[PDB]
């Protein structure tokens, strides 16, 4: 029993010791379609400037507070800030013209239901950069990082009342409803895509 968990945990622990998970993949550090000119970086939260963390928290709250209150979770600043600043947090940040932060993902390498996973805790875009393919590109980066670290899936939570995001994940990206989702036994679904 412990042996199976140890092999899973070894892979997670190794991924969490990486320096730049995108070092081998420079093609994914630029997104220049549909009028954008973005550079993308992957850093641990400890590598981000405090003002960048503030921008990311504020964007999450602007985009999500109402939908959190419409869910059973509610929104509390402290809980979300603690989640976003946990030492285990990794970030993909998209910088328009390499200068203005316009989108991010907070993700982790973790164990979920006994499996090594890349868990996507946030994908958040400023309104002006939406519907230009950047969100899809960021999720493709997550899928690539999951593969390169030997994770078994990318996983995330989406509110049922977040209709646009639900269609983005289920239809455009063909994520499945994960077996851990409440619907497979609530205001959200747990979605995943196997590596």
């Amino acid at each position: 029993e412990r042996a199976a968990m140890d092999a899973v945990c070894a892979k997670v622990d190794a991924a969490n010791r990486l320096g730049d998970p995108l070092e081998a993949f420079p093609v994914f550090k630029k997104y220049d379609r549909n009028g954008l000119n973005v550079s993308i970086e992957c850093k641990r939260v400890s590598g981000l400037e405090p003002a960048t963390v503030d921008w990311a928290f504020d964007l999450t709250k602007t985009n999500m507070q109402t939908m959190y209150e419409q869910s059973e979770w509610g929104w509390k600043d402290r809980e979300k800030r603690e989640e976003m600043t946990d030492d285990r947090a990794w970030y993909l940040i998209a910088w328009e013209n390499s200068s203005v932060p316009v989108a991010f993902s907070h993700f982790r390498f973790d164990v979920e239901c006994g499996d090594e996973v890349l868990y996507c805790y946030e994908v958040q875009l400023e309104s002006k950069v939406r519907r230009k393919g950047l969100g899809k590109f960021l999720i493709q980066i997550l899928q690539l990082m999951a593969n390169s670290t030997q994770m078994k899936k990318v996983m995330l939570t989406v509110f049922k009342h977040n209709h646009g995001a639900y269609q983005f994940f289920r239809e455009a990206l063909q994520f499945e409803i994960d077996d851990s989702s409440p619907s497979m036994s609530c205001s959200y679904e747990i979605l995943s895509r196997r590596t």
């Binding site: 958040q124 509110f159 609530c186």
Partner: peptide, 5 residues
């Protein structure tokens, strides 16, 4: 957004 059960 977030991590449900």
């Amino acid at each position: 957004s977030g991590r449900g059960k």
